[PDB]
Write a protein that binds this ligand. Structure first.
Ligand SMILES: O=C(NC[C@H](O)CN1CCc2ccccc2C1)c1cccc(NC2CCOCC2)c1
Ligand SMILES: O=C(NC[C@H](O)CN1CCc2ccccc2C1)c1cccc(NC2CCOCC2)c1
Ligand SMILES: Nc1ncnc2c1ncn2[C@@H]1O[C@H](C[C@@H](N)CC[C@H](N)C(=O)O)[C@@H](O)[C@H]1O
Ligand SMILES: Nc1ncnc2c1ncn2[C@@H]1O[C@H](C[C@@H](N)CC[C@H](N)C(=O)O)[C@@H](O)[C@H]1O
Lengths: 322, 313, 303, 322
């Protein structure tokens, strides 16, 4: 529903890992797809979905001249403001090796099918920017043997204690809305003054492409967290992992964090009321991913050691627009 | 690119603004860069008219400073230019005609100069701007002689009468068409069918009566006006968008060329009936020029960067 | 010392232009975001499908330079309140487009003219913009002291300029702006860029913009007089205005071409500095009351 | 976005005019479409769009056995709850002359094109239930020479004075929302204790089918109302007129009101602040119909004798879901 500002792209483009990791993913995939004798006979068609100011496009060009293989590029991008940068790059530099498309990927009528699609449409909880829906809406123009980059991503949750953060969320009450809406939406936050009560566990997973007979992106999952200290639960830190290609990955899960990657902070899922937890007990929580045609949202509850209110029922406090 | 002779720039900017046949038979081109990094303009002479817009097959070329909003021939070697810079500039062609040189560049308008026209004698010119002023120039002197704030909005089009060196028509977005005559103490006079029509966007005097003219409006209508009668003689809904230009043929009983932002050309007879129509352009149609050598040939340029030669029944 | 910008409507190279003006002494630049003449189509084929790029690339300046140095201008062809339906629709779309672009660039301010009585639709498009997404940019309205129509030379023989006074008619311009910010529901993001002319209006109608959210004053080059030594100055009355406007800590904006080639643009600017230097000096109260202006406190519960 | 309750259908089905008027419209149209000699050779295909509990379907059956002509019926209906009634009617009574379809008309893939489509999807301000959008989304399955019933509708506005109603709207402030939202949405209301300051004037018109090259349902319109009394403006009553077929119409415009039709009350458009109007003056108001892919809304202002705030900018206080 909204468009990223120039300065936003600017800051994230400087990531020292996200980009080289993608270059390396396309590199590996190109080889696995066109064998040495075929190198000049076979030109792989590559589509970048959400091309921004073009760094993934450049990185593709860098991948091909590293694999020493040949590629046709599309740069699809919904933000018309960014599409301006792109269209300037392609006249000044790229040439007609890159076709720039100014539309949504759910919408674009592709002149031809793709060998590999490529996207980074992920948020700190993996699928919280509707990359499922976008890549699902685009996959009809991927060749039957086509690769998606990324191939999969997986979300995670760990319970945390932090009065400091509980108090910051509380402080987010606004006039003219539910006096408890603050509590029913996830915050992107650099988690600092906090305690992690249990090791993260996987939450939601999506694979691409979705060879699913009839596709469904909704989810419900139950997690049990062993707690071995006394404390008070104030919410859940979410993180994610993703497979770009084969062994080439990115992660913000602390135990596998990608060294030097600053592109994503963790997410916070608060709870309306803090819950005491005795040393020895299990925290059971539950998450649902929900949707209609217009929006996708999360809803969640704690069921042990006591219950909370089901949070965010209906996306009444927050949804992400489709 | 056969040679692109000395001083001509390497590339020609996409947005073609103007096209003018010399009595000689050659073709003058104006071009703006209206998007991308550099917002400039350029001038071109094409002795081979069929070879345009191709840069290497040109007789002469030159980068102007800013874009060209309008232009016109001066005599036979002179090129008078309406700049984005707020300048009116005069470029004079080489003696061999293989080089195009600055003659004067005067920054006298406070905003983009959008329209320019040469007066009958050929010694003077009148320009119009977004600064709402209209100015009369001594071309030999390189000075503004007279300045006129007649309008209340930006000036869209000025046009000298065929034969009288002191009469010219102007129109602006303040909804006025003005008949001028500098001989009067109060120069301008407001001519029109009556009270507010749609905004006037283009003008052409009849090449045969200093008494009659056509105007085009923002709604796609071309109308025929008699100053001698002050009533709206005849009109027709010729376009689906703004009418940006009107050009009479050299024929004895002349035809009227009619260009528009609907990307089409139309040719009209005496009574404004449709004789021809062309979709050749896939962006805006900016100028039309009739061949001096072949009077059934007509050339048009657009923002699609096409230079297009029409055969007219 | 005052903060002041240049108002240009022509920029061949954005790098060179910015350098020029800053080297001339200016604090910031008013320039277009798309080419002033580059009329775009959004509905009808084929023009609708015109190959891009629609404009320059952001990469041409640092984010910092955008945020701090450039004030956007709305393209002059954009007429949301045209009586022609098709023009109205393209103007809507174009206005949105140039507005979202300014916001994309994070420009500190963006300029829009009130040069007629009716700006209902311009207002509605802008309100609509303000309540969409998140940005903090200021919107400056270019309103003139004297309407363009009441400034025209009396040189149309059959349409004279109605000679003797109308108290209301010298005020019409304030009502253009009044109505405009009432429809926009006194947004705090919409302020005034008042244009000064050669002929000041009656003292009353200058009074009129007392109290209003003036954030800038636009002085065209063409209203400066010229002294014994060919330098540009202002009439006695025009100085009264500057001094008043200085109190409001407006930013000044020079517009139009140089009309005294005998020196740089920096001379106009030099003069302004001279007037700021030579203001009726700050007193005991006024020095003290400085960082407190228009700041509302609730009084104390004294007991 | 919502589904009408059984009792709602029940009450409106009892209208003594809306139904006979539709019967008469289909009757006239059938004749004009199949000539006397063709009567048994030509079976007109008729689609009812938004069939509810089936009264328009019955009325079609009644029209055909009055025109003495032959028809194939579809009954499309989005409300699955009503679709239950329909599917019961068609097994107990109608037989396979009626095909009942349970979907949205924007969505239904029609097995065949229609001779005549039929709908009543109108609200007190004509197009305030998105009948434009629905019939536009359905028209691709109407034969090239196909009739729509209704053919057109037209909205209207008149300014009114009523402190009583101004005070009722005011009383509609709710917690947790803009303290002035009450004022930025139209109320269906039986207008009683009020003064009508000027004669109604037409506002928005839509024709069906829309042979429009590229279709646009958005609108902007300006109205000037002569006022010849002193008073205070508190809002605008909207009404509507519609042509079903030829001369057969329905109306809630007072000057042409359909005798005995209770199916629609007028609508009220309030204004945040009341505006004094001197005897002699003109009220200028302005209305826009606006939309995106998800919702349609109105926005409006008074420009004379003074300005109001532009009301409802962005559909921030109310929209109708698509
Ligand atoms: O995790 C964050 N935001 C969730 C976003 O989906 C992050 N992605 C990161 C990838 C990306 C690429 C292009 C355009 C936008 C984005 C947004 C986030 C938000 C603000 C700041 C940061 N972290 C860095 C810390 C180091 O300095 C720069 C900000 C991270
Ligand atoms: O105008 C009203 N509502 C706007 C609706 O679009 C009316 N239409 C009327 C047609 C119709 C048919 C089937 C299902 C719903 C509807 C709704 C309205 C609402 C409540 C009551 C009434 N009026 C009558 C007055 C006589 O007694 C029954 C209620 C009218
Ligand atoms: N459905 C969609 N269709 C087309 N583009 C999209 C869609 N959703 C998101 N985008 C764009 O995808 C980009 C996501 C960015 N994380 C990637 C930016 C760029 N590739 C970079 O890594 O720097 C943004 O520019 C979005 O505007
Ligand atoms: N887009 C749509 N597709 C299918 N049905 C719809 C749609 N929009 C509205 N409807 C149905 O149309 C009906 C509108 C009613 N006014 C008509 C009811 C019934 N025909 C009657 O006159 O008693 C409701 O039952 C709606 O649920």
């Amino acid at each position: 529903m909204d468009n990223l500002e120039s300065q936003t792209y600017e800051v994230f483009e400087k990531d020292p890992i996200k980009y080289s990791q993608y270059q390396q993913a396309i590199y590996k995939c190109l080889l696995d797809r066109v064998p040495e004798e075929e190198k000049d006979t076979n030109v792989q068609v590559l589509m970048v979905l959400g091309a921004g100011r073009g760094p993934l496009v450049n990185a593709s060009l860098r991948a091909a001249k590293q694999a020493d293989r040949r590629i046709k590029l599309y740069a699809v991008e919904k933000n018309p403001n960014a599409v301006v940068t792109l269209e300037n790059w392609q006249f000044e530099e790229w040439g007609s090796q890159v076709t720039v498309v100014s539309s949504d990927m759910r919408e674009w009528v592709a002149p031809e099918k793709a060998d590999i699609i490529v996207s980074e449409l992920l948020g700190s909880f993996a699928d919280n920017e509707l990359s499922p829906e976008c890549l699902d809406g685009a996959q009809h123009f991927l060749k039957d043997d086509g690769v998606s980059i990324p191939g999969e991503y997986t979300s995670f949750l760990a319970p945390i204690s932090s009065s400091k953060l509980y108090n910051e969320v509380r402080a987010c009450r606004e006039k003219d809305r539910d006096p408890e809406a603050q509590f029913e939406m996830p915050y992107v936050v650099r988690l600092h003054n906090f305690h992690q009560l249990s090791a993260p566990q996987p939450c939601f997973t999506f694979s691409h492409p979705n060879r699913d007979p009839m596709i469904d992106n909704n989810r419900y999952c139950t997690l049990e967290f062993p707690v071995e200290v006394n404390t008070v639960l104030h919410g859940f830190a979410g993180y994610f992992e993703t497979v770009l290609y084969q062994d080439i990955t990115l992660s913000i899960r602390p135990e596998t964090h990608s060294p030097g990657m600053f592109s994503w902070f963790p997410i916070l899922f608060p709870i309306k009321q803090p819950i005491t937890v005795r040393e020895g007990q299990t925290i059971c929580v539950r998450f649902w991913r929900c949707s209609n045609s217009k929006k996708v949202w999360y809803e969640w509850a704690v069921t042990a050691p006591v219950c909370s209110a089901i949070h965010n029922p209906t996306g009444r406090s927050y949804t992400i627009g489709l | 690119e056969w040679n692109l002779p000395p001083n001509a720039p390497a590339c020609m900017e996409r947005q073609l603004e103007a096209a003018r046949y010399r009595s000689d038979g050659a073709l003058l081109l104006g071009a703006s860069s209206l998007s991308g990094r550099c917002w400039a303009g350029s001038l071109w002479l094409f002795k081979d008219p069929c070879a345009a817009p191709n840069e290497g097959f040109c007789s002469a070329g030159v980068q102007t400073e800013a874009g060209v909003a309008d232009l016109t021939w001066v005599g036979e070697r002179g090129i008078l230019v309406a700049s984005d810079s707020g300048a009116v500039e005069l470029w004079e062609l080489d003696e061999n005609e293989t080089l195009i040189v600055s003659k004067f560049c005067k920054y006298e308008h406070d905003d983009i100069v959008s329209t320019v026209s040469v007066l009958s004698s050929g010694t003077q010119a009148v320009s119009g701007s977004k600064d709402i002023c209209i100015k009369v120039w001594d071309l030999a002197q390189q000075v503004v002689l007279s300045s006129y704030r007649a309008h209340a909005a930006q000036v869209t089009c000025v046009a000298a009468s065929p034969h009288k060196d002191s009469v010219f028509l102007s129109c602006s977005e303040d909804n006025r068409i003005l008949l001028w005559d500098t001989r009067c103490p109060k120069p301008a006079s407001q001519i029109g069918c009556s009270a507010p029509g749609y905004l006037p966007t283009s003008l052409a005097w009849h090449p045969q009566q200093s008494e009659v003219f056509v105007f085009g409006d923002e709604n796609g209508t071309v109308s025929l006006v008699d100053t001698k009668s002050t009533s709206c003689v005849l009109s027709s809904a010729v376009h689906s968008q703004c009418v940006t230009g009107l050009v009479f043929s050299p024929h004895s009983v002349p035809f009227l060329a009619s260009l528009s932002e609907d990307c089409s050309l139309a040719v009209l007879d005496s009574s404004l009936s449709e004789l021809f129509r062309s979709q050749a352009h896939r962006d805006f149609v900016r100028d039309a020029t009739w061949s001096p050598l072949n009077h059934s040939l007509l050339t048009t340029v657009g923002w699609d960067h096409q230079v297009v030669h029409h055969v007219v029944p | 010392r005052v903060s002041s910008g240049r108002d240009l409507n022509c920029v061949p190279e954005i790098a060179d232009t910015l350098g020029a003006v800053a080297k001339q002494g200016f604090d910031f630049l008013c320039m277009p975001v798309f080419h002033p003449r580059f009329k775009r189509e959004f509905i009808q084929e084929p023009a609708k499908n015109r190959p891009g790029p629609q404009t320059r690339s952001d990469l041409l300046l640092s984010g910092r330079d955008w945020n701090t140095l450039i004030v956007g201008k709305l393209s002059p062809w954009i007429r949301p309140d045209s009586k022609v339906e098709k023009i109205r629709r393209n103007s809507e779309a174009a206005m949105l487009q140039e507005l979202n672009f300014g916001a994309y660039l994070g420009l500190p301010a963006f300029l829009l003219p009130l040069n007629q009585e009716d700006n209902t639709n311009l207002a509605r498009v802008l309100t609509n913009h303000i309540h969409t997404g998140h940005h903090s940019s200021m919107f400056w309205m270019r309103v003139p002291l004297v309407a363009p129509e009441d400034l025209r030379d009396d040189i149309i023989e059959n349409a004279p300029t109605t000679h003797t006074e109308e108290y209301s008619g010298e005020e019409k311009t304030w009502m253009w702006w009044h109505n405009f910010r009432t429809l926009c529901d006194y947004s705090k993001r919409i302020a005034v860029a008042l244009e000064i002319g050669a002929d000041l209006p009656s003292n009353h109608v200058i009074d009129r913009w007392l109290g209003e959210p003036i954030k800038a004053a636009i002085l065209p080059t063409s209203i400066f007089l010229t002294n014994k030594k060919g330098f540009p100055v202002l009439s006695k009355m025009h100085q009264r205005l500057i001094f008043r406007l200085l109190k409001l800590e407006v930013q000044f904006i020079i517009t139009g071409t140089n009309h005294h080639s005998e020196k740089e643009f920096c001379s106009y600017l030099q003069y302004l500095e001279y007037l700021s230097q030579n203001r009726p000096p700050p007193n005991a109260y006024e020095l003290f009351a400085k960082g407190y202006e228009d700041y509302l406190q609730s009084p104390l519960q004294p007991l």
